Amino acid sequence: PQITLWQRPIVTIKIGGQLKEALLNTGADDTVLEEVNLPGRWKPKLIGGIGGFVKVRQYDQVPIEICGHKVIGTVLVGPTPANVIGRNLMTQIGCTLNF
Amino acid sequence: PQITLWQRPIVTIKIGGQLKEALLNTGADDTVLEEVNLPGRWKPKLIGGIGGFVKVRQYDQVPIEICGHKVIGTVLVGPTPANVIGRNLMTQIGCTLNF
Numbered sequence: 095p096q097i098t099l100w101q102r103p104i105v106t107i108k109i110g111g112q113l114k115e116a117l118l119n120t121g122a123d124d125t126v127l128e129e130v131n132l133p134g135r136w137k138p139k140l141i142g143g144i145g146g147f148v149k150v151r152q153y154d155q156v157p158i159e160i161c162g163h164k165v166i167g168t169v170l171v172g173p174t175p176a177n178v179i180g181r182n183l184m185t186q187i188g189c190t191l192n193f
Numbered sequence: 194p195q196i197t198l199w200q201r202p203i204v205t206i207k208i209g210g211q212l213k214e215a216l217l218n219t220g221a222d223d224t225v226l227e228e229v230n231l232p233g234r235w236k237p238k239l240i241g242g243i244g245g246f247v248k249v250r251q252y253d254q255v256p257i258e259i260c261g262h263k264v265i266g267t268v269l270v271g272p273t274p275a276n277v278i279g280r281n282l283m284t285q286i287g288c289t290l291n292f
């Protein structure tokens with residue numbers, strides 16, 4: 095798909111038998127999602143930093159679908175002003191900037 | 194150009210004749226740049242918001258070049274962790290997300 099940038103590039107993602115909305119953010123290195131009960135082991139992770147850090151949980155090799163593209167990737171789970179799909183998953187789905 | 198997202202998509206812009214470094218941020222609506230003495234009239238603008246707003250200067254129809262594309266658009270000038278090219282300018286160069 096080709097997504098123009100007149101509007102915020104919000105897409106539907108499928109994460110664990112659950113459909114959500116997330117913004118494709120090339121300004122973000124990682125993918126952060128509002129609390130969801132992903133199964134299994136996870137590692138603590140600090141994100142953000144300016145003014146202090148926020149702790150989230152790092153889930154690895156998570157299966158997730160982005161506009162019908164099934165990918166495996168690291169998902170950070172915790173508080174966030176919105177769901178954000180970062181560069182880590184955009185390379186998995188082969189997403190690039192073109193002009 | 195086609196820019197893959199394995200690394201931060203940082204690019205070179207030409208503004209006020211100056212050569213500068215900036216990040217292509219689809220997560221951002223607007224373009225915000227380090228202090229620069231752009232000439233002529235401007236408008237106060239509030240940006241950010243979470244925890245408070247930051248006051249910047251809004252300059253319209255500024256000539257700017259991005260990776261060899263001469264374009265025209267609104268540039269906000271004020272403090273910022275780093276220079277950011279937002280969607281307003283990415284539409285002007287016809288930059289899209291593709292996967």
Ligand SMILES: OC[C@H]1O[C@@H](O)[C@H](O)[C@@H](O)[C@@H]1O
Pocket residue numbers: 226227228271272273
């Ligand atoms: O973003 C604007 C800022 O640019 C910095 O390079 C300057 O040291 C600071 O004085 C100015 O306010």
